[PDB]
UniProtKB/Swiss-Prot annotation, chain B:
Function: Activates eif2ak2/pkr in the absence of double-stranded RNA (dsRNA), leading to phosphorylation of eif2s1/efi2-alpha and inhibition of translation and induction of apoptosis. Required for siRNA production by dicer1 and for subsequent siRNA-mediated post-transcriptional gene silencing. Does not seem to be required for processing of pre-miRNA to miRNA by dicer1.
GO function term, MF aspect, one: siRNA binding
Family: Belongs to the PRKRA family.
From-to range in the entire protein, with total length: 112 to 180 of 298
Location of the DRBM domain: 1-69
Origin: domain of life: Eukaryota
One GO CC term, this protein: RISC-loading complex
Protein's recorded name: Interferon-inducible double-stranded RNA-dependent protein kinase activator A homolog B
GO BP terms: regulation of regulatory ncRNA processing; siRNA processing
Length: 60, 69
RNA sequence: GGCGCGCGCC
RNA sequence: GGCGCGCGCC
């Protein structure tokens, strides 16, 4: 999973664990110096999308 | 909403409602795959996915696509 | 939500 | 023990 993978990355890198804001659906994810917001039809999807976005901005 | 669109088609056409059946269940507990068969009127299609819900949606979409054909 | 069956990282 | 994720059933 993107969330699981994001976590493992942080733990691996020695970064403080990812932080997700309370779902509002949009959820903002922050890890290291990254900040990405995800949207979706459910809170679960928003979180997943925020994670995927962060990993993507990480690869670039 | 494929499942819903297919049901409406059937009702509008005067067909008995679509019937969905689990044709196959496989894979390890954490990565299962399901296959569902969708039968309506004279059509029969199969759909697969990570969950029974998803497989059902796929089976319905395929049947509608076969219907337009 | 409960029950159950699993997996990843630490 | 902790964090996370997946599926079924109710």
């Amino acid at each position: 999973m993107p969330v699981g993978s994001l976590q493992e990355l942080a733990v691996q890198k020695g970064w403080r664990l990812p932080e997700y804001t309370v779902a509002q659906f949009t959820i903002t994810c922050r890890v290291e110096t990254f900040v990405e917001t995800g949207s979706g039809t459910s809170k679960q999807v928003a979180k997943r999308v925020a994670a995927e976005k962060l990993l993507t901005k990480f690869k670039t």
